[PDB]
Structure 1
Amino acid sequence: GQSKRVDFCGKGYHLMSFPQSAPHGVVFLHVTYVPAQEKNFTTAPAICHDGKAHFPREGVFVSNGTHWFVTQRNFYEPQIITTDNTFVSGNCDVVIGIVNNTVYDPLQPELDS
C-alpha cells in the first residue's frame, strides 16, 4: 500500500516501496517524491469578488506580480481563477488578508454569445 505516515517509509512523500531479501533481514527501497526548485509568490487567504469572498477548493492563491492564479499546493500549475476553482463563503469583511481580484465566470461569456 501507500502510507501517509510521515518519514515512516522514506524522506519525502511516499510513492511506493520494493522489498529485497538480505542475509538475516530485509531491505526496503523506498521510492518517494521530493519537491524541488521552489519559487516565492505573493499569497492571499481569499479573493474578494463583487460583495463575495472566494476560497480555493483544492489549491492556493498565488500572484506572479500582476495577475492572480490558483495552483495546487505541491506543484506550480497556475490556473485562471474561475467559479469552478473556488467557492463562496460570505462577504469581504471577516477575512484578514482578503485581496481584491476578479473571478471569471466560465458560463457568462458563452451565454452572452
Structure 2
Amino acid sequence: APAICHDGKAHFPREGVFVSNGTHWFVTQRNFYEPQIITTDNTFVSGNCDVVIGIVNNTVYDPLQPELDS
C-alpha cells in the first residue's frame, strides 16, 4: 500500500514500505525482510487522506499509551 489512514490523516513510512500477509500490516526496510510493528516513530503525517490514490484503512499504534498510565 502507499499509505495508511487513521483519522482522516494520511501517514507515510519514514523508510521502507508497508506489507501484509493478509493477517496484519507491517513496515519493513527495502533490501531485507525484517518486519516491525507500525508506530508513530517510523512514520510521519502529511496532509489528508482524500488526495492520495490507493490508500488503505487501518490503525496506527502509539507506544506512549501504556506508559502514560503510570
TM range (shorter): over 0.9
- Specify every segment of 5 or more residues in structure 2 that has no aligned partner in the other structure, as ranges: none
User: Offset of 1:68 from its aligned partner?
Assistant: 0.5
Hey, which of these two has a bigger chunk of strand by percent? 1
Moved over 3 A (4+): none
Aligned-pair CA distance for 1:98: 0.7
Aligned to 2:47: 90
1:66 shift after superposition: 1.8
Give the fraction of aligned pairs with identical amino acids, expressed as a percent: 100
Once the two structures are TM-superposed, the CA of residue 112 in structure 1 deviates from its matched residue by 2.5
TM-superposition CA deviations, 1:7-34 (whole Å, max 9, x none):
xxxxxxxxxxxxxxxxxxxxxxxxxxxx
RMSD after superposition: 1.0
Show structure 1 runs of 5+ residues with no match: 1-43
String of CA shifts for 1:12-70, please: whole Å, max 9, x gaps: xxxxxxxxxxxxxxxxxxxxxxxxxxxxxxxx000001121110001100011121000
* Structure ranking higher on relative contact order (CA contacts 8 Å, 6+ apart): 2
Q: Aligned partners of 2:51 and 2:69: how far apart in 1?
A: 34
1:75 counterpart SS class: coil
Match of residue 104, structure 1, among 36, 61, 65: 61
Normalising by structure 1, we get a TM-score of: 0.59
Size of the aligned set, in residue pairs, is 70
Secondary structure (helix, strand or coil) at the match of 1:79 reads: coil
TM-score (norm 2): 0.92
Compare CA radii of gyration and give the structure with the larger one. Answer: 1
